[PDB]
Scaffold this motif. Structure first.
Motif, PDB file in Angstrom:
ATOM      1  N   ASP A 132       0.824  -1.206   0.000  1.00 37.60           N
ATOM      2  CA  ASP A 132       0.000   0.000   0.000  1.00 37.60           C
ATOM      3  C   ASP A 132       0.857   1.256   0.000  1.00 37.60           C
ATOM      4  OD1 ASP A 132      -2.364  -1.390  -0.089  1.00 37.60           O
ATOM      5  OD2 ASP A 132      -2.622  -1.422   2.100  1.00 37.60           O
ATOM      6  N   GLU A 190      -3.311  -1.008 -10.268  1.00 34.51           N
ATOM      7  CA  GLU A 190      -4.671  -1.059 -10.803  1.00 34.51           C
ATOM      8  C   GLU A 190      -5.357  -2.403 -10.582  1.00 34.51           C
ATOM      9  OE1 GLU A 190      -1.855  -0.504 -12.317  1.00 34.51           O
ATOM     10  OE2 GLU A 190      -1.758  -1.392 -14.323  1.00 34.51           O
ATOM     11  N   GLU A 191      -4.683  -3.368  -9.958  1.00 36.35           N
ATOM     12  CA  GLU A 191      -5.294  -4.621  -9.514  1.00 36.35           C
ATOM     13  C   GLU A 191      -5.926  -4.525  -8.130  1.00 36.35           C
ATOM     14  OE1 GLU A 191      -3.038  -8.503 -10.598  1.00 36.35           O
ATOM     15  OE2 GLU A 191      -1.651  -6.853 -11.026  1.00 36.35           O
ATOM     16  N   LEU A 192      -5.831  -3.373  -7.468  1.00 34.46           N
ATOM     17  CA  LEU A 192      -6.315  -3.224  -6.099  1.00 34.46           C
ATOM     18  C   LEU A 192      -7.576  -2.371  -6.113  1.00 34.46           C
ATOM     19  CD1 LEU A 192      -3.219  -3.936  -5.900  1.00 34.46           C
ATOM     20  CD2 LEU A 192      -3.219  -2.726  -3.689  1.00 34.46           C
ATOM     21  N   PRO A 193      -8.769  -2.974  -6.207  1.00 34.14           N
ATOM     22  CA  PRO A 193      -9.988  -2.181  -5.996  1.00 34.14           C
ATOM     23  C   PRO A 193      -9.964  -1.548  -4.633  1.00 34.14           C
ATOM     24  CG  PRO A 193     -10.499  -4.442  -6.691  1.00 34.14           C
ATOM     25  CD  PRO A 193      -9.061  -4.414  -6.269  1.00 34.14           C
ATOM     26  N   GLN A 194      -9.325  -2.249  -3.697  1.00 38.62           N
ATOM     27  CA  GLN A 194      -9.205  -1.905  -2.296  1.00 38.62           C
ATOM     28  C   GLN A 194      -7.723  -1.991  -1.950  1.00 38.62           C
ATOM     29  OE1 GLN A 194     -10.977  -5.916  -2.766  1.00 38.62           O
ATOM     30  NE2 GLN A 194     -11.160  -5.703  -0.524  1.00 38.62           N
ATOM     31  N   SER A 195      -7.311  -1.290  -0.895  1.00 39.39           N
ATOM     32  CA  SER A 195      -5.942  -1.456  -0.418  1.00 39.39           C
ATOM     33  C   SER A 195      -5.710  -2.901   0.022  1.00 39.39           C
ATOM     34  CB  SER A 195      -5.643  -0.492   0.734  1.00 39.39           C
ATOM     35  OG  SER A 195      -6.350  -0.854   1.912  1.00 39.39           O
ATOM     36  N   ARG A 199      -8.129  -5.512   2.088  1.00 38.17           N
ATOM     37  CA  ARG A 199      -8.338  -6.894   1.669  1.00 38.17           C
ATOM     38  C   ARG A 199      -8.081  -7.867   2.819  1.00 38.17           C
ATOM     39  NH1 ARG A 199      -7.467 -10.168  -3.461  1.00 38.17           N
ATOM     40  NH2 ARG A 199      -6.407 -12.111  -2.835  1.00 38.17           N
TER      41      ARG A 199
END
Ligand SMILES: CC(=O)SCCNC(=O)CCNC(=O)[C@H](O)C(C)(C)COP(=O)(O)OP(=O)(O)OC[C@H]1O[C@@H](n2cnc3c(N)ncnc32)[C@H](O)[C@@H]1OP(=O)(O)O
Length: 209
Positions: A132, A190-195, A199
């Protein structure tokens, strides 16, 4: 020159306790030496060879030169050398290395945790908050890691955070007396909709703290 360095990261709560990241410093010599010496047979099979005896490499007096070199790399923006703290105490390291910006904006990530504290979610939390940080403060796009196929525990940690396998590097790194294959895994911002921390919390592997 070196965005996101120096900094503290976290904290996150895991079953083992409260986990955070902060820069290596000179006073870590005693704890780094004590743990690496005691944990030799848990670490040596999974660590790059240094060409030195393990006990001379990890004497208390060896740390100032190692710490100085890590911080020099960090102030040139090529590394972020963090200590993993459990409840405020040194329990391992999380290192972001080979940092590039430009059109690449990538780095590798590595870690280790004192064997007496393993199985409590520390490495997973350290990796999540390290990722992150890279994808926000360090302005990176991509983080990769290399890991021996045999290193099932580390592969579990990487899978917890969502790393993808991208390749197999033949005879990649001198480890435990031979050039060993390492898997190459990666994840992009850009693979992290969420941190990654979010997750972990959603999966029940950490709690906000
Ligand atoms: C990218 C790299 O840095 S590769 C090198 C990684 N570093 C090393 O291998 C150094 C030696 N080993 C270590 O430092 C530690 O054992 C680490 C970093 C691998 C793991 O640290 P931990 O704090 O125990 O990790 P964490 O608890 O977050 O996750 C470990 C998971 O692997 C599981 N696991 C442990 N051993 C095994 C195994 N032999 N097979 C399958 N799973 C295993 C654990 O149970 C845990 O998953 P779970 O909670 O779902 O049960």
């Amino acid at each position: 020159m070196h965005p996101g360095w120096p900094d503290t990261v976290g904290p996150l709560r895991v079953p083992a306790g409260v986990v955070g990241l902060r820069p290596v410093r000179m006073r870590d010599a005693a704890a780094w030496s004590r743990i690496r010496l005691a944990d030799q047979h848990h670490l040596e099979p999974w660590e790059p060879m240094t060409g030195m005896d393990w006990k001379v490499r990890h004497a208390v007096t060896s740390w100032p030169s190692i710490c100085s070199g890590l911080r020099a790399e960090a102030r040139h923006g090529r590394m972020l050398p963090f200590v993993i703290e459990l409840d405020g105490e040194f329990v391992g390291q999380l290192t972001i290395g080979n940092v590039t910006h430009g059109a690449l904006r990538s780095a590798w990530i590595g870690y280790w945790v004192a064997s007496s504290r393993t199985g409590g979610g520390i490495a997973t939390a350290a990796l999540a908050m390290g990722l992150d940080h890279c994808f926000t403060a360090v302005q990176l796009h991509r983080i990769e890691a290399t890991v021996r196929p045999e290193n099932t525990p580390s592969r579990a940690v990487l899978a917890h955070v969502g790393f993808r396998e991208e390749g197999l590097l033949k005879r990649y790194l001198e480890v435990d007396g031979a050039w060993r294959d390492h898997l190459l895994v990666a994840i992009t911002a850009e693979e992290l909709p969420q941190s990654a921390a979010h997750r972990l919390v959603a999966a029940g592997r950490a709690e906000w703290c």
